[PDB]
Write an enzyme that holds these catalytic residues in place. Structure first.
Site, PDB file in Angstrom:
ATOM      1  N   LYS A  58      32.575   1.491  46.586  1.00  0.00           N
ATOM      2  CA  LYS A  58      32.740   0.315  46.465  1.00  0.00           C
ATOM      3  C   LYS A  58      31.494   0.229  44.641  1.00  0.00           C
ATOM      4  O   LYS A  58      31.621  -0.353  44.094  1.00  0.00           O
ATOM      5  CB  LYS A  58      31.812  -0.092  47.440  1.00  0.00           C
ATOM      6  N   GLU A 195      32.837  -8.924  46.612  1.00  0.00           N
ATOM      7  CA  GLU A 195      32.268  -7.299  45.987  1.00  0.00           C
ATOM      8  C   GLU A 195      34.254  -7.033  45.157  1.00  0.00           C
ATOM      9  O   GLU A 195      34.478  -6.844  44.075  1.00  0.00           O
ATOM     10  CB  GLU A 195      31.926  -6.246  46.482  1.00  0.00           C
ATOM     11  N   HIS A 463       8.241  -7.543  28.797  1.00  0.00           N
ATOM     12  CA  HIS A 463       9.129  -8.109  27.778  1.00  0.00           C
ATOM     13  C   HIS A 463      10.201  -7.140  27.491  1.00  0.00           C
ATOM     14  O   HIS A 463       9.332  -5.511  26.999  1.00  0.00           O
ATOM     15  CB  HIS A 463       8.383  -8.952  26.937  1.00  0.00           C
TER      16      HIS A 463
HETATM   17  C1  LIG Z   1       8.536  -1.576  16.953  1.00  0.00           C
HETATM   18  C2  LIG Z   1       7.711  -2.851  18.333  1.00  0.00           C
HETATM   19  C3  LIG Z   1       8.259  -3.080  19.367  1.00  0.00           C
HETATM   20  C4  LIG Z   1       7.559  -3.454  20.725  1.00  0.00           C
HETATM   21  N1  LIG Z   1       8.224  -3.453  21.536  1.00  0.00           N
HETATM   22  C5  LIG Z   1       7.425  -4.317  22.062  1.00  0.00           C
HETATM   23  C6  LIG Z   1       8.239  -4.278  23.561  1.00  0.00           C
HETATM   24  O1  LIG Z   1       9.325  -4.046  24.111  1.00  0.00           O
HETATM   25  N2  LIG Z   1       7.290  -4.918  24.998  1.00  0.00           N
HETATM   26  C7  LIG Z   1       6.290  -5.118  24.429  1.00  0.00           C
HETATM   27  O2  LIG Z   1       5.476  -6.052  25.552  1.00  0.00           O
HETATM   28  N3  LIG Z   1       5.355  -5.604  23.664  1.00  0.00           N
HETATM   29  C8  LIG Z   1       6.276  -4.803  22.713  1.00  0.00           C
HETATM   30  N4  LIG Z   1       5.192  -4.604  21.044  1.00  0.00           N
HETATM   31  C9  LIG Z   1       4.302  -5.317  21.174  1.00  0.00           C
HETATM   32  C10 LIG Z   1       3.930  -6.157  20.672  1.00  0.00           C
HETATM   33  O3  LIG Z   1       4.842  -6.796  20.091  1.00  0.00           O
HETATM   34  C11 LIG Z   1       2.478  -7.365  20.589  1.00  0.00           C
HETATM   35  O4  LIG Z   1       1.774  -7.119  21.540  1.00  0.00           O
HETATM   36  C12 LIG Z   1       2.567  -8.807  20.426  1.00  0.00           C
HETATM   37  O5  LIG Z   1       3.637  -9.015  19.105  1.00  0.00           O
HETATM   38  C13 LIG Z   1       1.492  -9.558  19.623  1.00  0.00           C
HETATM   39  O6  LIG Z   1       1.518 -10.768  19.246  1.00  0.00           O
HETATM   40  P1  LIG Z   1      -0.279 -11.472  18.405  1.00  0.00           P
HETATM   41  O7  LIG Z   1       0.510 -13.226  18.505  1.00  0.00           O
HETATM   42  O8  LIG Z   1      -1.294 -10.464  19.365  1.00  0.00           O
HETATM   43  O9  LIG Z   1       0.332 -10.358  17.059  1.00  0.00           O
HETATM   44  P2  LIG Z   1       2.087 -11.158  16.454  1.00  0.00           P
HETATM   45  O10 LIG Z   1       3.315 -11.146  17.324  1.00  0.00           O
HETATM   46  O11 LIG Z   1       2.386  -9.477  15.410  1.00  0.00           O
HETATM   47  O12 LIG Z   1       1.794 -12.020  15.919  1.00  0.00           O
HETATM   48  C14 LIG Z   1       0.652 -12.423  14.581  1.00  0.00           C
HETATM   49  C15 LIG Z   1       1.885 -12.798  13.406  1.00  0.00           C
HETATM   50  O13 LIG Z   1       0.286 -13.497  12.914  1.00  0.00           O
HETATM   51  C16 LIG Z   1       0.400 -13.321  11.637  1.00  0.00           C
HETATM   52  N5  LIG Z   1      -0.676 -13.549  11.116  1.00  0.00           N
HETATM   53  C17 LIG Z   1      -1.770 -12.427  10.387  1.00  0.00           C
HETATM   54  N6  LIG Z   1      -1.886 -12.743   9.635  1.00  0.00           N
HETATM   55  C18 LIG Z   1      -2.465 -13.844   8.970  1.00  0.00           C
HETATM   56  C19 LIG Z   1      -2.738 -15.599   8.353  1.00  0.00           C
HETATM   57  N7  LIG Z   1      -4.262 -14.654   7.606  1.00  0.00           N
HETATM   58  N8  LIG Z   1      -2.539 -16.719   8.256  1.00  0.00           N
HETATM   59  C20 LIG Z   1      -0.857 -17.061   8.793  1.00  0.00           C
HETATM   60  N9  LIG Z   1      -0.312 -15.654   9.419  1.00  0.00           N
HETATM   61  C21 LIG Z   1      -0.690 -14.153   9.692  1.00  0.00           C
HETATM   62  C22 LIG Z   1       1.590 -12.218  11.024  1.00  0.00           C
HETATM   63  O14 LIG Z   1       2.237 -12.108   9.786  1.00  0.00           O
HETATM   64  C23 LIG Z   1       2.047 -12.335  12.492  1.00  0.00           C
HETATM   65  O15 LIG Z   1       4.005 -13.300  11.885  1.00  0.00           O
HETATM   66  C24 LIG Z   1       6.056  -4.027  19.601  1.00  0.00           C
HETATM   67  C25 LIG Z   1       5.330  -3.685  19.195  1.00  0.00           C
HETATM   68  C26 LIG Z   1       6.346  -2.659  17.704  1.00  0.00           C
HETATM   69  C27 LIG Z   1       5.297  -2.787  16.850  1.00  0.00           C
HETATM   70  C1  LIG Z   2      32.981  -1.660  51.825  1.00  0.00           C
HETATM   71  C2  LIG Z   2      31.596  -1.574  52.313  1.00  0.00           C
HETATM   72  C3  LIG Z   2      31.073  -1.751  51.976  1.00  0.00           C
HETATM   73  C4  LIG Z   2      29.437  -1.365  51.787  1.00  0.00           C
HETATM   74  N1  LIG Z   2      28.188  -1.662  51.111  1.00  0.00           N
HETATM   75  C5  LIG Z   2      27.072  -1.431  51.148  1.00  0.00           C
HETATM   76  C6  LIG Z   2      26.095  -1.842  49.875  1.00  0.00           C
HETATM   77  O1  LIG Z   2      26.182  -1.264  49.207  1.00  0.00           O
HETATM   78  N2  LIG Z   2      24.779  -1.166  50.319  1.00  0.00           N
HETATM   79  C7  LIG Z   2      24.527  -1.339  52.096  1.00  0.00           C
HETATM   80  O2  LIG Z   2      23.099  -0.941  52.149  1.00  0.00           O
HETATM   81  N3  LIG Z   2      25.424  -0.996  53.215  1.00  0.00           N
HETATM   82  C8  LIG Z   2      25.956  -1.109  53.303  1.00  0.00           C
HETATM   83  N4  LIG Z   2      27.991  -1.347  53.587  1.00  0.00           N
HETATM   84  C9  LIG Z   2      27.472  -1.271  55.051  1.00  0.00           C
HETATM   85  C10 LIG Z   2      26.881   0.274  55.222  1.00  0.00           C
HETATM   86  O3  LIG Z   2      28.299   0.458  55.400  1.00  0.00           O
HETATM   87  C11 LIG Z   2      26.531   0.130  57.029  1.00  0.00           C
HETATM   88  O4  LIG Z   2      25.503  -0.293  57.253  1.00  0.00           O
HETATM   89  C12 LIG Z   2      26.553   1.352  57.584  1.00  0.00           C
HETATM   90  O5  LIG Z   2      27.752   2.563  57.165  1.00  0.00           O
HETATM   91  C13 LIG Z   2      25.744   2.158  59.025  1.00  0.00           C
HETATM   92  O6  LIG Z   2      25.921   3.336  59.299  1.00  0.00           O
HETATM   93  P1  LIG Z   2      26.104   2.622  60.955  1.00  0.00           P
HETATM   94  O7  LIG Z   2      25.593   4.201  60.962  1.00  0.00           O
HETATM   95  O8  LIG Z   2      25.517   2.022  61.760  1.00  0.00           O
HETATM   96  O9  LIG Z   2      27.825   3.132  61.462  1.00  0.00           O
HETATM   97  P2  LIG Z   2      28.616   3.921  60.742  1.00  0.00           P
HETATM   98  O10 LIG Z   2      27.730   4.280  58.777  1.00  0.00           O
HETATM   99  O11 LIG Z   2      30.551   3.366  59.854  1.00  0.00           O
HETATM  100  O12 LIG Z   2      29.088   5.698  61.027  1.00  0.00           O
HETATM  101  C14 LIG Z   2      29.324   5.021  62.117  1.00  0.00           C
HETATM  102  C15 LIG Z   2      30.295   6.791  62.547  1.00  0.00           C
HETATM  103  O13 LIG Z   2      30.773   6.478  63.526  1.00  0.00           O
HETATM  104  C16 LIG Z   2      31.977   7.648  63.642  1.00  0.00           C
HETATM  105  N5  LIG Z   2      32.638   6.976  65.579  1.00  0.00           N
HETATM  106  C17 LIG Z   2      32.649   5.954  65.579  1.00  0.00           C
HETATM  107  N6  LIG Z   2      32.865   5.754  67.537  1.00  0.00           N
HETATM  108  C18 LIG Z   2      33.062   7.072  67.785  1.00  0.00           C
HETATM  109  C19 LIG Z   2      33.591   7.997  68.676  1.00  0.00           C
HETATM  110  N7  LIG Z   2      33.459   7.520  69.622  1.00  0.00           N
HETATM  111  N8  LIG Z   2      32.498   9.636  68.257  1.00  0.00           N
HETATM  112  C20 LIG Z   2      32.536  10.081  67.005  1.00  0.00           C
HETATM  113  N9  LIG Z   2      32.411   9.119  66.328  1.00  0.00           N
HETATM  114  C21 LIG Z   2      32.749   8.257  66.011  1.00  0.00           C
HETATM  115  C22 LIG Z   2      33.199   6.521  62.812  1.00  0.00           C
HETATM  116  O14 LIG Z   2      34.204   6.933  62.949  1.00  0.00           O
HETATM  117  C23 LIG Z   2      31.461   6.475  61.480  1.00  0.00           C
HETATM  118  O15 LIG Z   2      32.036   7.880  60.850  1.00  0.00           O
HETATM  119  C24 LIG Z   2      29.405  -1.479  53.482  1.00  0.00           C
HETATM  120  C25 LIG Z   2      30.180  -1.421  54.461  1.00  0.00           C
HETATM  121  C26 LIG Z   2      31.144  -1.450  53.880  1.00  0.00           C
HETATM  122  C27 LIG Z   2      32.349  -1.724  54.708  1.00  0.00           C
END
Ligand SMILES: Cc1cc2nc3c(=O)[nH]c(=O)nc-3n(C[C@H](O)[C@H](O)[C@H](O)COP(=O)(O)OP(=O)(O)OC[C@H]3O[C@@H](n4cnc5c(N)ncnc54)[C@H](O)[C@@H]3O)c2cc1C
Ligand SMILES: Cc1cc2nc3c(=O)[nH]c(=O)nc-3n(C[C@H](O)[C@H](O)[C@H](O)COP(=O)(O)OP(=O)(O)OC[C@H]3O[C@@H](n4cnc5c(N)ncnc54)[C@H](O)[C@@H]3O)c2cc1C
Ligand SMILES: NC(=O)c1ccc[n+]([C@@H]2O[C@H](COP(=O)([O-])OP(=O)(O)OC[C@H]3O[C@@H](n4cnc5c(N)ncnc54)[C@H](OP(=O)(O)O)[C@@H]3O)[C@@H](O)[C@H]2O)c1
Ligand SMILES: NC(=O)c1ccc[n+]([C@@H]2O[C@H](COP(=O)([O-])OP(=O)(O)OC[C@H]3O[C@@H](n4cnc5c(N)ncnc54)[C@H](OP(=O)(O)O)[C@@H]3O)[C@@H](O)[C@H]2O)c1
Lengths: 484, 485
Positions: A58, A195, A463
């Site tokens: 699946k 699904e 973020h």
């Molecule tokens: C390339 C890059 C990727 C990043 N990716 C992430 C991320 O994925 N996740 C995350 O959490 N953080 C990330 N960061 C960090 C995040 O961007 C900073 O932590 C956050 O922007 C800080 O916010 P701030 O208000 O403290 O300063 P800022 O957000 O930088 O705002 C400051 C502003 O004040 C202005 N300013 C400065 N001085 C003066 C002034 N004297 N007068 C008027 N305006 C002024 C500036 O020009 C600026 O626009 C990343 C940073 C960079 C450089």
């Molecule tokens: C289409 C589909 C999608 C699913 N997707 C998810 C998912 O994304 N995430 C998730 O957590 N769960 C999912 N499930 C549920 C998951 O498949 C079951 O919770 C899990 O397989 C249960 O394990 P089990 O041991 O209890 O039973 P089973 O896994 O089915 O094991 C039972 C086994 O015992 C065998 N058996 C039965 N009787 C006998 C017997 N008398 N002698 C010998 N062998 C025997 C059977 O043939 C089988 O192979 C999905 C189910 C289906 C049908």
């Protein structure tokens, strides 16, 4: 005395986890697993529902569909890709099956390695501490063991109407279909139906979902209804309040053409349609009826098929335990089955006293737009604690990645359910958006820690990632303020 | 009576958050924001670093590169796509700038809506409670207010070596670069350096990273090393323990050609190379030196430039507060800036008494393979609690979605640090894998709740998703057992 310390019936998620955990403490363990073919003849290797016909296949097809959206999203980011890329069903099934085959084999090897005996035979109890195992050729042998663990899973349920077993497929068949399904009717409107319809539509097929009553009964309907809307907007057609009463083959083929006849659940009107494939996804039945539970005295609930057990996975008969999808009132998911299986073994042979906790187990529905949850839905929360004591915080969000392709603004949705009478304990977590599973896992470990809205407010978001939305929710549903 | 209740210097992350939060409670508020151009003359709108030259453009570019991998990956899932797709730098930049524009505008409109006065002018203190504001045309005005909030941010740091300001670009320029950078040299080895190198490589350019000492100083070095190996195993070339000494222009163009001369950090060895673009990502300098801090008495750290402050964001001068990047020994991240701003206003104008918690703040390094962390690194933990009391659980993992493309098995890695003397509480969380931000956010909330290894084990994983790996960690580093797949 006995042949084995423990015999496990079923070699899927629960069974194999338990086998390996048991073997680790030096126990003599045997695992029985057999896969009864599908009406149409589909069968598969060791591993269970998840490995062969559930989670694994699946998820991979979910990804084939997500990758299709990725192709499209790549244009506005600069990638010189055509406006319409074609998908190949056969190529996909072959890849998914190679991977499945690799796990069938890996499982086999892990058992040999850990000294567990694997028998590809159907098992069934014949009397106290004893069991018969029948292989494919019909050859039989009897084995005894100090304890037994029932872990047989369930199987796709049928409608019991003309043509179902004859022309329809279920989830057991879909994941290995030898030809493209073509126009498809999927019947049912919960996990499997949505699904599957979701990924079928995502790789280009004409998909229609026939709903009897509502979507995802049991889940938060507010969330379910939005999953529905997203699917509608994105291709999938729905037929509401109808149930098929007859499927007939207009012509055989790979695929052929089929005629489905349906009736209203509140009218006598009847309708009919033509589809290449008709998938049934209307539930699954516990495999507890044919294993001779009477010959050993294990009581189940004869109405539902589920085995009631203690809070240690023990049944009425003390040396027989059960885990997995077959338990009554638990959670039917792979990781739950694995946890029960590992802990059970630990309590039996390693002196542990830790029990599996079935409360607040998180789940993720892998619909085109994923849905992640843990805890109570809003409906069940209001009910358990009273509307007056529940505060709901929520918000739409727009994934940064979506802005460049310029799609789906304000379609993603997050909401938490808080208990006012209890320091605003976060009793429900719901998320509708990309990578919902990844977003929900960690919050689920925080609900186990007693997360309160206060603590959540004091966690700084990362973020710019989707999950951060939960870090700053301020609008409540009670306040009436818009969150659009 | 003063002209305003509050004047904010800086209209970036911290500044705009506090502005909106203070206008919420009806106070008269003014926000000064001015963007002094880069040596090459690049300037941009309202929003701050994040919006115009940080988080936003960065992640969006990181995404252009993940999509490249998605196109590759799509073939084995059955999509008929070419073995090699071409990428257009212009279409990419034009798209990112069209989005940045929206945010500039959105931010202006939000200021108007909350009745906040916005002056596109440079601000500086001139005397107690008074400030001078200079716009673009030199025209000035003086304003007073009951309280001031400094939120000026920082700006890329330069090397001070021949050719740097003349021929090199910094993150301020990269995000609007009007031509494809071509063969590129990235000097530096932390956040900006690795992320930027990572994504230019991902869209198909020859990229090299020159590293002075170690990668990501301050972060867990085991994780840092692995991010390294991953980048190295996926194209990116590294030159170790060298530092550039001269950048000269073999030929101007769009792009042109440059010759870089660099020298060993432990020998007299000297090398040289040719590149189309040379990006400096060696740090950032607090914009606290030219705002007239002496005329009003605000004490800073003369060495670093960082404003020291109380656990309420209050400087030495009572009516002067500071938030964001410029603070000393805090967390240089957008969401932290935002938290401080909002809460500061609440304390001033709404009776709140809640201070911003700078402990265990989460972060994610958006490298080709992402790294998310929260809490302590292993080294940092062993120090604080003693090696004998730290148990490290870890594991490799292989995303399900990678099996069909059949790539990178045993590359993702997960690890937690527990303090045995404290119920095995999870003091540190690290993950190297896809969507590491999405996976880290919730666990950060769990650490806030005192998450213990036992509670983690009792949490059921969601299958099949990467985060579930944290759900079942049993192999400790001390045990010696292998953690391969
Ligand atoms: C390339 C890059 C990727 C990043 N990716 C992430 C991320 O994925 N996740 C995350 O959490 N953080 C990330 N960061 C960090 C995040 O961007 C900073 O932590 C956050 O922007 C800080 O916010 P701030 O208000 O403290 O300063 P800022 O957000 O930088 O705002 C400051 C502003 O004040 C202005 N300013 C400065 N001085 C003066 C002034 N004297 N007068 C008027 N305006 C002024 C500036 O020009 C600026 O626009 C990343 C940073 C960079 C450089
Ligand atoms: C289409 C589909 C999608 C699913 N997707 C998810 C998912 O994304 N995430 C998730 O957590 N769960 C999912 N499930 C549920 C998951 O498949 C079951 O919770 C899990 O397989 C249960 O394990 P089990 O041991 O209890 O039973 P089973 O896994 O089915 O094991 C039972 C086994 O015992 C065998 N058996 C039965 N009787 C006998 C017997 N008398 N002698 C010998 N062998 C025997 C059977 O043939 C089988 O192979 C999905 C189910 C289906 C049908
Ligand atoms: N991502 C995951 O983790 C995942 C994914 C898929 C499956 N699973 C597991 O697999 C289990 C089985 O899922 P399932 O979706 O097959 O069944 P389900 O959860 O029991 O839901 C049955 C669905 O079929 C409908 N239905 C029942 N009888 C019908 C009939 N005669 N005609 C038309 N519609 C009918 C129901 O509608 P009403 O509301 O009218 O009853 C409901 O939509 C799950 O509950 C779960 O444990 C997990
Ligand atoms: N994902 C995110 O949240 C994110 C992403 C990007 C940026 N940011 C923010 O931006 C801040 C600044 O980022 P930054 O990476 O530019 O700097 P930084 O974090 O200060 O690291 C400076 C890097 O440049 C090297 N360096 C310093 N002087 C040098 C010189 N003369 N020659 C060669 N290399 C030199 C350093 O090596 P040494 O070890 O030898 O010092 C180090 O690798 C961060 O700390 C963070 O607050 C956050």
């Amino acid at each position: 005395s006995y042949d084995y310390d423990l015999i496990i019936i079923g070699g899927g998620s629960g069974g194999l986890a338990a086998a390996k955990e048991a073997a680790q403490y030096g126990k003599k363990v045997m695992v029985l697993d057999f896969v009864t073919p599908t009406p149409l003849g589909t069968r598969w290797g060791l591993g269970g529902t998840c490995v062969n016909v559930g989670c694994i296949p699946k998820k991979l097809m979910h990804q084939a569909a997500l990758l299709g959206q990725a192709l499209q999203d790549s244009r506005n980011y600069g990638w010189k890709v055509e406006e319409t890329v074609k998908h190949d069903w056969d190529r996909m099934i072959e890849a998914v099956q190679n991977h499945i085959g690799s796990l069938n084999w890996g499982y086999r090897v892990a058992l040999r390695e850990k000294k567990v005996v694997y028998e590809n035979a159907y098992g069934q109890f014949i009397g106290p501490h004893r069991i018969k195992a029948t292989n494919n050729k019909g050859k039989e042998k009897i084995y005894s063991a100090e304890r037994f663990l029932i872990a047989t899973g369930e199987r796709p349920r049928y409608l019991g109407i003309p043509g179902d077993k004859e022309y329809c497929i279920s989830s057991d068949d879909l994941f290995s279909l030898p030809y493209c399904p073509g126009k498809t009717l999927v019947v049912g409107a919960s996990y499997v139906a949505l699904e599957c319809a979701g990924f079928l539509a995502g790789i280009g097929l004409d998909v229609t979902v026939m709903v009897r009553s509502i979507l995802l009964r049991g889940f938060d309907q507010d969330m379910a209804n939005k999953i529905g809307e997203h699917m509608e907007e994105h291709g999938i057609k729905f037929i509401r309040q109808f149930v098929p009463i007859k499927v007939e083959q207009i012509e055989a083929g790979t695929p052929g053409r089929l005629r489905v006849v349906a009736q209203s659940t509140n009218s006598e009107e009847i309708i009919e349609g033509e589809y290449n494939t008709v998938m049934l996804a209307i539930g699954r039945d516990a495999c507890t009826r044919k294993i001779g539970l009477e010959t050993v005295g294990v009581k189940i609930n004869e109405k539902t098929g589920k085995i009631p057990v203690t809070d240690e996975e023990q049944t009425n008969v003390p040396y027989i335990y059960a885990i997995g999808d077959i338990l009554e009132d638990k959670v039917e998911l792979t990781p739950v089955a694995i946890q029960a299986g590992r802990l059970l073994a630990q309590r039996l042979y390693a002196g542990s006293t830790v029990k599996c906790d079935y409360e607040n187990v998180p789940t993720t529905v892998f619909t085109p737009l994923e849905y992640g949850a843990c805890g109570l839905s809003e409906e069940k929360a209001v009910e358990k604690f009273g509307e007056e004591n529940i505060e709901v915080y929520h918000s739409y969000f727009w994934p940064l990645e979506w802005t460049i392709p310029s799609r789906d603004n304000n379609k993603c949705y997050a909401k938490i359910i808080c208990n006012t009478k209890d320091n605003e304990r976060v009793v429900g977590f719901h998320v509708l958006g990309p990578n919902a599973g990844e977003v929900t896992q960690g919050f689920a470990a925080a609900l186990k820690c007693g997360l309160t809205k206060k603590q959540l407010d004091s966690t700084i978001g990362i973020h710019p990632v989707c999950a951060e939305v939960f870090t700053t929710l301020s609008v409540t549903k009670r306040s009436g303020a818009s969150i659009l």
